[PDB]
């Protein structure tokens, strides 16, 4: 069986995230992002207090996660690779090549797992982020402004 | 420990641990320590208006 490799970008879910590399990520303590939003204002008369335009300043912070995958090597594979007990005959060269084929076929899937699992993490975080529709829709509708 | 060229050389190489009442933060590493070799830094990821 030839497994098919999946690249995260080709997936339609990639449209929901802005990916970017950052080699020195393990040294980040509290990544901080900033917002500054102003709101409009209308003027009225009569027994209404005259209002002033407002500004808002919002600050969010980064949340850190991780991904891990495993990769196994049997003892005989190490023995064949280290050449510690080699006899220099054509019989063991085939065994060594079998071990290396196993290692490479294994490593390909191990590397593919990160690509395949970034989508999993994005689904997980989006689920943990989304409030239910049945609440969000009326809330965003039946209150004009708030307070 | 931040690898800056020192501003001034210190004279009078005398025991410092005895007079540790002065100063506001005192640390003495025996020979070396992995707390020196830390580089945790804080990052700002751009702002939006």
């Amino acid at each position: 069986n030839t497994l098919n490799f999946v690249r995260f970008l080709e997936l339609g879910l990639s449209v929901a995230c802005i990916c970017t590399k950052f080699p020195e990520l393990a040294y980040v303590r509290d990544g901080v992002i900033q917002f500054e939003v102003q709101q409009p204002m209308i003027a009225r008369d009569g027994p209404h207090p005259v209002d002033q335009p407002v500004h808002n300043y919002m600050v969010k912070r980064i949340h850190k996660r991780s991904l891990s995958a495993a990769f196994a090597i049997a003892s005989e594979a190490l023995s064949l690779l280290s050449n510690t007990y080699v006899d220099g005959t054509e019989i063991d060269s085939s065994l060594r090549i079998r071990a290396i084929q196993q290692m490479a076929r294994n490593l390909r899937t191990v590397l593919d797992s990160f690509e395949r699992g970034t989508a999993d993490q994005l689904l997980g975080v989006l689920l943990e982020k989304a409030p239910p529709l049945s609440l969000l829709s009326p809330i965003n509708k039946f209150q004009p402004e708030g307070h | 420990p931040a690898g800056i060229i020192p501003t001034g050389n210190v004279l009078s190489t005398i025991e410092v641990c005895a007079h540790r009442c002065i100063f506001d933060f005192f640390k003495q590493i025996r020979s070396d320590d992995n707390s020196l070799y830390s580089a945790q830094f804080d990052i700002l990821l751009g702002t939006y208006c």
Binding site: K21, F22, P23 | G3, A39, F41, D42, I43, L44, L45
Partner: peptide, 19 residues
């Protein structure tokens, strides 16, 4: 994106950095 130059020296000596 990576940190270098003035950003690097700031992150090393002061402990903060900005894009």
């Amino acid at each position: 994106m990576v940190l270098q130059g003035t950003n690097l020296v700031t992150a090393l000596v002061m402990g903060k950095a900005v894009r």
